[PDB]
């Protein structure tokens, strides 16, 4: 953007705390504050009410999600493997 | 308090068995009677002094004090 060069969102941390700390935190401060798309009603209303808990806007649903996002790579691969074991068990 | 828009019902309260008194009050704009019943002050607001003086005599029972200024 015109107002900055490479601070992104963590400009609000002034000139303190270092450099790679702010680089390692900007990558997460955008994800946790973005609004995801509720895959239950389709609208753009998914938001973090605290650590690990995601809310929607209209369908009023609440889903336990990651601390900074809504699907950890671990969670999604575990769901896939759960599918692949139910398939094996139930033929 | 309460307001009574109806002369006959006002009279019915007047000849109930529990009104302590009735105060007649005059002013160049209006005349208002106030029956102090057991629990409420029932005010009647007559804006036509001729019908007001006819109602004054209409008020039947033995409690007619007091007339004010």
């Amino acid at each position: 953007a015109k107002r900055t060069k490479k601070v992104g969102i963590v400009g609000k941390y002034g000139t303190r705390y270092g450099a790679s700390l702010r680089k390692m935190v900007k990558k997460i401060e955008i994800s946790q504050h973005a609004k995801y798309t509720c895959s239950f009603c389709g609208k753009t209303k998914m938001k973090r009410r605290a650590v690990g808990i995601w809310h929607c806007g209209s369908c009023m649903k609440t889903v336990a999600g990651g601390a900074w996002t809504y699907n950890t790579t671990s969670a999604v691969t575990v769901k896939s493997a759960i599918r692949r074991l139910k398939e094996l068990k139930d033929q | 308090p309460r307001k009574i828009e109806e002369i006959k019902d006002f009279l019915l309260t007047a000849r109930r068995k529990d009104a302590k008194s009735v105060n007649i009050k005059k002013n160049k704009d209006n005349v208002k009677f106030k029956v102090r019943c057991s629990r409420y002050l029932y005010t009647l607001v007559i804006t036509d002094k001729e019908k007001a003086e006819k109602l004054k005599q209409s008020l039947p029972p033995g409690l007619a004090v007091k007339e004010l200024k």
Partner: protein, 147 residues
């Protein structure tokens, strides 16, 4: 749940001996939501966050909120981001070997429950607290140990 990043799931169960409901609080397995129907017991087949006794599941059902002895109401591996992997059973003597978060391999007796799926609140330790005050606010909801 204040002072823990693994948010709890409050569940309403019909009580099959009277006319009432019991409302429990499990450790929400990742990916469950409001308005899901959670299946608990011996014959409830594999689904996310649908607890069924270890030993009647295949090898690799990534569980969390495991038990320790049959009937503890769930003890092991329920903090934010953890899970325990069943390796293989011993059909007689009802021993199932689980691999625990710290690389341990414990021989847990079978027929003890475990919620299927990983713990919510995962990925929590990847963001530097970045400021003494924030660390203070973290520990002041748990215990007087921080400075």
């Amino acid at each position: 749940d204040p002072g823990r990043g693994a948010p709890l799931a409050k569940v309403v169960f019909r009580d099959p001996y009277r006319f009432k409901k019991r409302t429990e609080l499990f450790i929400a397995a990742e990916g469950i939501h409001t308005g899901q129907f959670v299946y608990c017991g011996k014959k409830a087949q594999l689904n996310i966050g649908n607890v069924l006794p270890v030993g009647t599941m295949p090898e690799g059902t990534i569980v969390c909120c495991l038990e320790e002895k049959p009937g503890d109401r769930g003890k092991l591996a329920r903090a934010s981001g953890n899970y325990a992997t069943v390796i293989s059973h011993n059909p007689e003597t009802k021993k199932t070997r689980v691999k625990l978060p710290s690389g341990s391999k414990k021989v847990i007796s079978s027929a003890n429950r475990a919620v299927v799926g990983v713990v919510a609140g995962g990925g929590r330790i990847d963001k530097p607290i970045l400021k003494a005050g924030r660390a203070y606010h973290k520990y002041k909801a748990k215990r007087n140990c921080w400075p």
